[model samples]
Target chain A: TLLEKSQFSDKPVQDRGLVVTDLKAESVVLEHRSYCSAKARDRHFAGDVLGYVTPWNSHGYDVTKVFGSKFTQISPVWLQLKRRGREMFEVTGLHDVDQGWMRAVRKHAKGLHIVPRLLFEDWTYDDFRNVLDSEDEIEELSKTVVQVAKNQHFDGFVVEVWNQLLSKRVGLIHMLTHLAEALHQARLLALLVIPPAITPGTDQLGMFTHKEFEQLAPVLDGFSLMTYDYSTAHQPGPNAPLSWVRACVQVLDPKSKWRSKILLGLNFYGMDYATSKDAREPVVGARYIQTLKDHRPRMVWDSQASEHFFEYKKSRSGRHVVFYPTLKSLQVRLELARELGVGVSIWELGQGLDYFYDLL
Target chain B: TLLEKSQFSDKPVQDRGLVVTDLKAESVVLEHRSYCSAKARDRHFAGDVLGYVTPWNSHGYDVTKVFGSKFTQISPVWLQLKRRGREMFEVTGLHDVDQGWMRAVRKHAKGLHIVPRLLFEDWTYDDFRNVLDSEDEIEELSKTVVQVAKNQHFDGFVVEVWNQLLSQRVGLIHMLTHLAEALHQARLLALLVIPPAITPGTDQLGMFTHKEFEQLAPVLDGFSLMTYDYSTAHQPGPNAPLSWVRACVQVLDPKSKWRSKILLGLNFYGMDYATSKDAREPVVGARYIQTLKDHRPRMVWDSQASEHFFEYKKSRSGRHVVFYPTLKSLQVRLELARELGVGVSIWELGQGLDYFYDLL
Candidate 1:
């Protein structure tokens, strides 16, 4: 135990009393099928500081309540668009949707879009083809989504099916166009979670090109450019190099009027690469601070990459290289978004420290 | 000593009779003032075999005449759009246009497009900005181009100002839209010369993206994907690997309705990289044949890269690696284009061997 119970709490963890402890379990159900539109005067918002929270991360729930005002749109990764058979779809994970949590956050920020990420996790490439090909299926799926959002009292949805349908370009355009049309008719926002434009080595085109963006720009309200995980286990480097982000913009929205729809992605998590052929894992902000306290390693800022990194040796595990995001790192990214005339999106609200909201 | 006048003639030049001779002299032009529409059936052809010729390369002029029927489109590197004072322009390079040459090419294949490449070499980024920003300038330029094409009896103009306008996304679309509209109204083809999607090392985004293509696809008749010179001296490796081309297609045209508009590029040249501190140079197919004859080195077909290469050493020049396209190399690329349902664009008809046309 390097990660002791006391150290597993909040930011810096100087005092254990600051730790979150729910008095009692909150009820999941609002128990009513009431439809409500987002409080945006029936139009798209000016700028969105989109932040996501996962149902599995209990820490994120408390963090979001404390710092919910930092984001214009909050997405709870709660639902999945699962495929069962021909022309049939299911929107699961509604049981994990905590109505109390959303109301608590909305009490203060009334204009906030309490959207939930509807993941398309249970479908093959063939399913994507069929659903997009058949107008009946597309209409069925779109109607199901509208019904789900209405019943759950959600303002909108963060569509997370982009990368899943990798090269199925025709189907992707068809599905998103139909879905966003349906969402628009219901006056709900359809924000798509786009794949990072520049992959690890930039050897190939990452996911979507500017051409695809132009085609989808008419229907989709917003596009979240997932400019994270630029570095990975196979090739560990900056989590998301600033230059890489610029290149993505260069490829995706060079001088296009639809750039306002783009929400620049930011990752709150860090990764540690080990020289010893061991399991490389991701580290959150609080745990990384603990590593600094334990090892007192010297951190160096890479100017070219515009990120921070440090190297430390373990007696048993050889050497380790870590790249993590801090307040200064995020401030620069936020400033860049400002310069680019766009908003920012955090991967999840939980992994980041409370002070990270200062960049907002 | 390796490259003599005799060896610089043609592919595997065993007979000097194949070498072209200027009997007395050929006049620069037909020297007539008339207008003629192309022999095409007032509509775009099914598949195009586009080849290019440079006026400086006298060798290419004869090669075009010998194998004119192989290509549906032949672009002599003539015509330059020179910028003058505010809202003024001049069409130069008409002096280099040869009407006799056009007649020779059309004698075999009457349905050929004898288009001349109009170079926008004399302008700054600001010029691109101003011309596109002003409606008067665009209309003026379009009329000037139409006048020159009609006067010269050229089928259409291959616009070659794409890379010059690099990041001027808005300006490019504006200029091309107006020009293509004007050309179409006159019943002329408007083919654009596009930059390679994946540059050397694929570090940053190349010239244009899918978004730009989608925007431009409506106005332009065809797009020449300049998928060549992928490898450079800074990081010399392969000259347009097959996988890299696939990635470029994956990016620019994933699954839109613009596949027919793309003209896959094929390079008829080779490059040699030296280990010693020296200048790396491009080698034509005939000169590359000379290298093979002189060095007598073992050639290697890089299966992964899908190109032909050979390593050699000289007493003065330490070690060298040469990558060039031969019959087999061009064959695979041609077959790939056939599979992709797009036509092919040879960089220049001169640099390649005469037999390279067999695959066409």
Candidate 2:
């Protein structure tokens, strides 16, 4: 029942008729080497909004078995690239590549949409300019993306450019627009993964500017706003505090014109501060919870931030401080997305925090 | 009443007749340059086997103002030495040389026994043998220690040869015996600062061996057994867990024949593990406690280990596990010392854990 009412059903109106129906169906028994249970498998994909299925543990587990039926719109992470020279780029390679990637997609192609993510974290502004400076270069890059999508029978593409705004913002927009037009021409949808830009005005010379968000927003089918990693390693705090989440969403869509076009991102992980003085490090949800359960510290809910954190004395002078999200706090985030009229987009599945799936 | 009843009054039997009288009456004011407090100043040195006055912060605080009457035996940390040649040595350096070091000692000489610590961590086994190889080399080193004690009007000396046991244990014993004889012939006492030898037999070739402990036990007036730094920098646990403490004591002196000769070493500082995955660094008591008070995680008592520890989640895959002592736990440690009839010796004064001083 919860799945029926989830934001997954709240698909973007722009992509309603754009989805292809009967593509291809194939019998591919993917290995289910996942730690989570398969209780909500039937109703997992009852709606329209896409979910990213990162083959985080793809070597041992089969992506098709784990997420083929659970998600209608699947975005496998990722097909990354790096620059070689002017008009020269190379595939950085994928983490977990099954020999039969197309077959994996074809297994759930009945009403499914494949939007494999393309990462370009290693590219510089000059490198991006090489692809965007000339129309011919832009066309070539777009053709490569489209051909890859076609070869794999992918339905769409999710362009993820790391530190994109920090690069040549104008050239990046041109590149995205060209990519979008080429995708649309091939009847393919294009989504942009935008990093969080909280406190834009104060950040005079920072990663994401508000103007950059508005510039490329109109050219994309939807936006995947990463609203995590707000805290620093040196001075750690909450990952995506409630206020920060609100600020991120508000900045991305000030007029609320593209609220439905956004796929709100969520993280099912926590951090560990060895001592209060040291920078925090990451810990998986299950392990984090187990540590808390073992020690059984009384976690304090930060009312203003809407997150839970705890601090304790480790030694005479060694204090450890930790901030993480609980089920209740995560639910609040979901409610926030629903109120914003946006669909949810988890970074990846199989984090072993299965209760998060049940919430869906 | 607690201070009066504390072991601070348990002066070393060997130093009772060596105290200097009518040393100084001049009110040469020394600054109270300390980070802790003046709250329990009067009642501070009420009881005392002794407490180590580091002179670590001598520039800002007068050692006498901070710990004058609190301890019965005052071990001003380090009148160190460095090797010049095979059988040659020189003063490494002093922190802040007071014009009248003896005057400072005399301020507490009324009911106090001054046995300043002597440090030489850089010496190799060969370097130690250079001094112990001949009676002349041994006499030179011993004379230097005795002269410094006489010049400072000290009641005795605390020989702290870092990793002495790890060196040529036989040579170290010889050096210590010579130093002890020199002090005794000068009508002063001898004490040795022994590093923690946790799980003695298990740690066959570590800090100090059980055999080494037994060898030095007979030649020294008492032992300052350091019982901290048990855990590693990457994964810091409790400094001196009760069971580990008991095990260390049992192995060092199983027959308990020399209980009175043992000054149970304690730590006044804590360590910080930056990232749960990162190596732990030091944080003082006040800072450690402040961080906890600021964040507020519930403290858990580990009944089986007879220690206190707390855990929290910092990030995805970063579960901070901290094991340290609390005031209550420290109290338990004190009770254990009382049960064993052994006196306590804190590492240093003014670590900001004034409550520990209050407990004494």
Candidate 3:
């Protein structure tokens, strides 16, 4: 039994104020399709809770049971915005969700902070600069965001401003400050979603400077370091190589200013590359499990990246490579966050990750 | 027993006036290191000879009985030239050979073409250009090359002018024509060494264009395509993947002007890479054989390359991958040459290639 696993023996069965009980591993099936009965809630965790959810329908039963019992705060990708013109901003993806979804989620997870995520659209350089330079537009955008959060009765707002905003450092800082102040005035917690590359001295594409992050750090509850996709299907390497993650954490929060608040994110999915040259195609946890069970391909560990990969010939001409994280690999990542003294979160729940509840 | 192998059953043993009698596979071992006592050349092979040798002392063997009986044409790297000044060429490795070695080689097997090979140094751009552009220098170089061949009583000369000459297409063509004429006047055949990338429309490094090759091809007896080094020890992959070799041949000699004369080159070596990130370290045949005996790593074939590779953890921190050609893989390469109606040569002889004579 998992209770007899030496590593878990010393630790409390339930962690982070979340209730852990007789949850069978099979209950965490693909799509979170199955439910973990309330009867499985055997103990309580002392730590805080955090998670990300996508479609409300995803993980159907697992969502309600896991969210209600485990997570204290849930983030959902709910909105998208684009720069219309100078001093003008337009909301798209508004129809992607509505008040009903929020109400339903709240009913399932009572007293949980529902933070709706807002992502920026693909804005052009000039128009992005135009919007950043307009203080009036920044104010208007902040107010609209706050109003949207209130209209949906969400407990907080998580705005995902991509790296392009960092190009104009001063403007981005000014815009973030104004937005944070406005959201704070609405009696809500404002969290910013930053990419893994939003750290100091990184030469990666879409990287943000430390100064920009430093200026904007104090105005938010915390930042979510979207650290997955470090290696995608297009790139045949580890999705979250431990060395890279360590470097990212050190660079993003050098002084540990937001270490406790930083929600270190992880990827539960794998990526398949068509030969080593093709783009990555996402393979969900369940599919990976199914493939392993059916094909039983030889898995090799890439120690340098702390990931596992396998290569197989699907046909005479089709050679493929899949880099994935196993339950053990996921534990390595989770331990990395724990060792760093940072909070952890996954990209989204209901990945049908059978060992998800056990890992928690 | 040799005749039992169906591939060579129809051909006569002694080919091109070269003897193939009583030569056992052991005679092929390590510069013919431990002789097969001329007792095992029991079968016939009507195949042409092709092989490369360095200085006899380089492999610490007369290597004549080993190479002459096995190869119809032995390409021994005997000379090197450095650009002393713009129009002044200085020869090195000149003292490395003499008539005694050639006479020994000839006595071992009559009618064998002792093609002494000449290679250029890492000349700077300006000096390289100057030498190529200087007609007087070209004449002096050619005369000196022919003189060296005559002094050694060598049958022919194979000049290895690397990619630098390709940049000055016209000058290279002129220099090659003059050199070929000079060698021919001495009653000797002249061959040129070219890389596999000397084909049209390739983005590979050190490649020459078809127009340049077309202009130069008519003047030489044939060209040796250096096909091995596709994956260096620094990078991990097959030295000569079959598909790449096919494309190279198609691009380099689309019309097959010198098909019969074209000497295909192979690498009788393996390259060890450190986790696909470190540089490749070339391992000779003997060393490869010894390593396999010592380590006994599981050998795996890469069908795409028609080669074999194996991986082993060297230390707790170092994972090494070695991609090398096997006897079967070499035969596949040889068969490729046969299919293309071209000859084949190895980089150098006497690294204890025990299967060399057998493959022939």
Candidate 4:
């Protein structure tokens, strides 16, 4: 539908052509996850497909299909990055959850990008091994990847670490380094889903640190920064701000210079809050993003800042409350992206919000 | 604790007067819930509570402890207006979650500065009632007010309406009008929460075209003009630029005369985003607000807009995402209130980047 017959084939070739078609997603969205309260889940947006954020994915697909014929599946490589349990990666448990994605990709898509899992939680190769469950699980997972690639033959792989990082897990990064080489030996390309250069060290063995990321970035075929979810419950303060992002960029292996090796991680989700008492409600996914446009919420767009805000006030029997996020406010993000010169890659696909493809 | 040794029953009336302890809050924030995903409950905060969000519930305990008093079954008059429903209120359930809160206050909290609930799925009363399961829902909700004022007792009520005007659900005007009169007959107070008035028909629902806010003002306790979340989501945006806030004050309800009823809504939260894809993750939260003591977030006490903002980015992978807001932002909102001859009220008690009381 997007084929502008005259413009379709005039795509430009760059110094390095980087195609990021595969979507590396996680089940972290509050609405989609069973862990979040029903209310939270409702607010979290359970419909969008990048794992529950469907609206956004289809929007992006509309764009990708229009951009270039050369596509690849690159999604959710960092299975080990979340701050949760070992059961997530188990073949039996993960089979339909995270593992089933491959078969899904092979069925409908062409451009495929495989993201390798990165260890982030209190981890060690032993920890990863436990989650991989048994040799059968590991072989099966590897075989699935090979079979999908050979059958449909994905363009490449993007390595995403989903596990929490720890000192003991440094070995896991090295192990992935070997895995990438292994995939290469089999003729499949691997891209490292690199962490920020300043990713905090895993002293508590709960998150991936800078050193661990450094050891792995060099071994992959590409490096895509899964730039998202920097803020969590225990984050010392706020999540990574733009300044921190810039600082990290400046510090990320000054030696590597392939814009192609760098894929920016984007988020299709929005963080939400409730009073401490209300925390019991689940809040995740694209549901948060939708709040911005509802009611065309009174908004203020900062052309200079390239962002906007929408606000509202609600009164019950008699208490006053206020909230905001408007379309103009949400649209400003696209404006921000237009202002910046980089390819856009998002985290997760569905809880649902209007995607920014035209802006891209 | 509010009663000092010199301030006793035997002491002079001035000296014996009970001191109103400030809520243990640092910053104030308000959100607007206009319209959002249908699946997302048309609840207020669920649609608008973003950035650094917190809940508003006294727990009856937290407030009781504040004044060194712990009476069983607290009366309506003693309940804090800001801290209403910490629990019980589902962020994703009630079509107008806060509506239940208002009714609860009328029944329990004595309607002290009772705010009304308006924007539910951006519906006007016509739209709301059309879709609402029961017509008696409103009447049932109103009974809570009469019961509270008669038996339980509290202060006046504050009225809040979310995006009623935006959705052009005109019947909201009639509904709010009727509710106000009903509360008055019950001897309960009513308050109105409004936008900054960038456009004419915004807060007054086109009925108050004269800016006199006559018909509604007569039945209302006062108005809360949202004075925060005024920044563009751009990095380097002014921190709470005051000019805009001042402009809002200039165009407020001329009939209200800037009395105690006029409480300016201040944002205790912030926003962060990739200013441009080339930028980093923008940080928006309490933690980020605590930082930037150095005014790095472009701290500003905008004498004009009377608000704040900053040009900064959040971290995501190795890229910079732009962001705005900080504690300095709160100071600006307060300063604007002082300059405008109005007291400032926080959005809710929970989600502030800093303490809401500190803003006082």
Candidate 5:
């Protein structure tokens, strides 16, 4: 009954137009940021207002089977805040993390499956780098997330702590290890958040160390790789790529202990680099797309990197560097991962490219 | 004769108790940055110190892999300017890309077996969002990467992108679709660089919408899942969990992509959240390692979230949350990834803990 139909059919049901039935259908639910500016929120809701793309739509959709919901698209955002509140109860009490607030959140956003993942208290460097690792302090913080995690009301926790800290080689390993273990105990899923590093090296080594990583992997359930910032305070490139990920994998210890992990990094969001050379460039993904279009080049898939790139000559302070990454480049890498059988995770809900789903 | 080891071994070896061998053994190479004022540079030596753990030392070390000489670790000046330059050339050079970088890297690293991999750029959000309907750009990126991704040059490209630029719903699906296509063309491998997303739904929604994932099965080569950054500027908690990764993989596209592509992400950084409510805490990763022993309490793990944590109770600030990743945490994740047959890749070379490679 929860699922209206069993399979995708040509003829429409009298009550439900097209229906689909499958056991493998999985849904990608987008969780919007409640704390974001009203403008961003308004834009998101406008998109949400559009019709739901499920098997029941005039064109039936199913999420369980391969190619199910071929054109169906939706963002799931009803679970974030309320679910987190429930997780907080697992460590402390229901009311301890954000008393009574969850009830209101659930009541208001019940139908939308999306939840607001909150960085409630002003996000500061101390919280991610210091408080997280302290057993005593984490015990206190656990009070906020444990209940919801325990109740299974909270799907998981996404920690975005790339900022507010300096880079130290060992800091991350320890931080993730501590947090992953804590979350795992609650029975709620855990996703380790990280910024992308396309280059082979870095200068600001964090408190984390390789050995700490040895300890960190076993505790957490999964992770979301934030693959952006090609032009961050750290380093810049022709942006990161699928190939970089492969090299990254080889660098890791083959003897890791985590199981069924998914390599889900960034696939959205862009940056505009104000180069010291006085070069102003749009560092985001969309910008690159436009640049390639203007190049008048026949974008051919390389079938190697599974990415897309073109001869992008943008003058920044009278400097120009060719950009790379094409549909073929993109596909090559994705296919590589597929053959390798690694799970993939993408960044936040789509910004304006929902059609990208069709590619997958 | 080519490696210099055969002749070196033939001569009655050293009085320093150094025994060098030619056998190819697994080794872990770590790269990180240190300032002129920092002790780590002198202490750890740009991960060069890790070389001591090689098979020569029965810290049971494996074969030593040397990408740089001991001098690179001698000072920040050399590291920032000279050493950085050399490595950059090696990582991005055409000879490095085509002329067997994997083999050459291992040899160049002074016998350390650097896993031959093509560290490619990020998976474009535009490609993820638009490649399906428009393969033009995707193809271009593919051409460049593939040209570099000749099978002989490197093992495979390590795909990496630190950010997602799109604000739409289907960004990932499109990206992965394009990625798969490119990889298939080259018959090369692909690895995905990812971050840790605590929320299961977001991770699930990434490229390869539950339905389109099957298409992903046949084409992907490999994946490197980045599982780091449990702590952030505004958030205080340990990282996510290994179990969550298991949950994510439990529901696969049913196409059964290759398992070798599965790699876990590890970080060498930590978080530095402000200790006080005044909220001036710097949420940094690599810096906390510099703190004195008195601040060790700041090195706590977020047990609830199943990751590491830290706390800095500043005199001037109200309270600061610090997440310090530790060697213990890294070990757990590594072991877990290995158990799951998921390879692991540290984000960048330098910013990791010293003991990481030792465990390997």
Candidate 6:
């Protein structure tokens, strides 16, 4: 399937390039003693490797269960909070929840926490206001979420709804505190999913701020920073620059008290960007290897950014640039996380090449 | 000198009108047992009568010194926080603060705390944001305030500025928490002057919120509830109705954890309003007595609201009504406070009658 005119030497693929004719990802052998697992879990610098999986990524389910020992916690996207009426709420999507997968993960890491990721997008602003206006209502909602976990035999939940109600910060705090209280009472982890601060400041207007982190640090068990999207497809660059990722960690904490609670978001997929403002698509390892074999573009390693990318041109098409992470790029991040005394979280385990598990 | 046609009998004043021929406020025989002072000072339900004074009313300074024994704490209007630049803040108005006045109050109540009221209104939005965005700046400003108290031989400070920065709740909390930390570190009291919540909801918009009170309860030493002005000059109604005052207290606390820290704002002045859209003026003891001697109106006790009001008319003018706090009306409120197990804060001691001190 390779284009004859576009073909180049395979020396780069054989050497230090991103190109690979095949992926050995499916052949997984799960065991810990990861960059995080090597250290004592009770220490201040102890870290966690939380892996998230979605139903759309069927391969992710396989990857997570196959290499479950590498992860301290696994979050399967299985719940969506819906607003039925002004004063009512319901959590749907429990039908797709696979307990078989849960049992499969527990077989590898016996102590691994199975926290389901709960997303909130369908609720109207008014519904949020109604619950926020009354403490009893918020507590009731918290109870509902906790009871769901309690019945499902889940270790905890990863809440991903703070941004939707960012404007109502006062209520937002109350809601989070209530949720944490409910979860803590049941001895479950009330983990919050946080977006990064756009700039370095305490009173941030664009994203989550350092002040909020300081307030919520004591109450919640852990914070999973959504620091992966430092750059998006619309404005393509390294997904998470070294400086940018470090900046987000600084916001979470530095003096070690709150550092342990932080989980740095590690992105698995990469962007194949078109310079001419064309639609960009996400690149996985298999797709990336296929591209490398067909186009044979030379990979350049950006040491400063700690990422791998390549640029190429078509016969009549505009210039194209692809920024993707290789083992070399991700290893640097893992080392940075270890140095900072924080944990790492893979967005999804199935998207990257199987050999990426070697570092874990 | 009375209008012959409009002449009314002085029996109403002698019987139950808000009229007194002259005031006997200067006479003070101080010793012991008030509604709050009667209870053990260290008990859970114990209360304090905190008196506030302003420089504009030279008489208020005299009243506080004379009746200082009746109050557990006295806040003299002395300081104003000003912004010099983006990063700098200065506390002004120390030149007018009288050390002699401080000594006089100390002589009356040896156990009384001399806390100065520090108001913040001179700063712009940008100044607030600049300091709010940087925790270091806020802590520096807090240190400056605490140092002033440390050097001046004062007990503490009463901060009055949350309303100005109500829009920036995140920064408001940070500023308040930082101030409390610095004050507590210096072993001085950190008090807050709070306005009433406009309506009964945790997520409030027009006034302070219950959630804000919840967040602030543990850090600040006390909160002086601004319960007056439930009805303002524009509205031409009672200063603070019993129901409205009770509603405000509900926001502060219920189960006594925060009850002791609550100090209800009791109005010393009364409203003299005209039926027509005219300017309303404040009424005090001597002026209220003068109105009784000159106009002669019958007072009505609104048992439901626990307030006193009287109606009168000027020559060829619209109806004029006066809502004032008499000994009888104030006793009801004092009893209510005892039942609620909270403290009280007088707007200013001089504006009220001398015998009103009997309830303190």
- Report clashes for each candidate as comma-separated counts: 3, 30, 23, 180, 340, 1
User: Best candidate per DockQ, number?
Assistant: 1
Best by lDDT: 1
Candidate 5: where is the Cα deviation over 4 Å? A1-360, B1-104, B108-132, B150-155, B161-163, B167-187, B194-213, B230-232, B251-257, B275-286, B294-308
lDDT string for model 1 (B1-360, tens) is: 332231122222112221122210010011000111121122222356788999766678887776676677888998899888687889997888888988887886687888889889879878877887899999999999999889888889899988875555777788899899999899888999988775656345566777788889878888888888887776677777886776676567766477777888888878888867555888875577667766766656677777767788878878898887755567677767767777788888788765455446
Name the candidate, 1 or 6, with the larger DockQ value. 1
TM-scores of the first chain across all predictions? 0.85, 0.76, 0.79, 0.53, 0.52, 0.84
DockQ of candidate 6 is 0.01
Best by TM-score: 1
lDDT per residue (tens digit) for residues A201-238 in model 3:
22221354244456677787767777777654544666
| Model 2 alpha-carbon miss at residue B127, Å | 87
Range of the 10 consecutive residues with the lowest summed lDDT in candidate 5 chain A: A23-32
TM-score of each: 0.65, 0.42, 0.46, 0.33, 0.35, 0.46
lDDT per residue as tens, model 4, A1-360: 111111111221111121112211121111111221111112111111122112224533332333212223344333333313433332111222234444455444444454433334445666566644444434434554545445543444454554444433655555565656667767887665556543432101114333444565566665556544444433222223343343343334322243334444555444443322232122232444334323224434334322332233334222111222222332333333333322335454432232222122
The CAPRI class of candidate 2 is: incorrect
Clashing pairs in 1: A210-B211, A211-B210, A211-B211
Error of 5 at A181 (Å): 41
TM-score for predicted model 1 compared with the true structure: 0.65
Least accurate 10 contiguous residues by lDDT in model 1 chain B: B24-33
Candidate 2 lDDT over residue span A322-358, tens digit each: 6655555666777788777776666565443443444
Q: Please give the TM-score that candidate 6 achieves against the real structure.
A: 0.46
lDDT for each residue of candidate 1 in A21-76, tens digit (9 for 90 to 100): 22111100110011111221222223568988986557788867766665688999
DockQ for every prediction shown:
0.23, 0.01, 0.01, 0.01, 0.02, 0.01
Interface RMSD of 6: 16.2
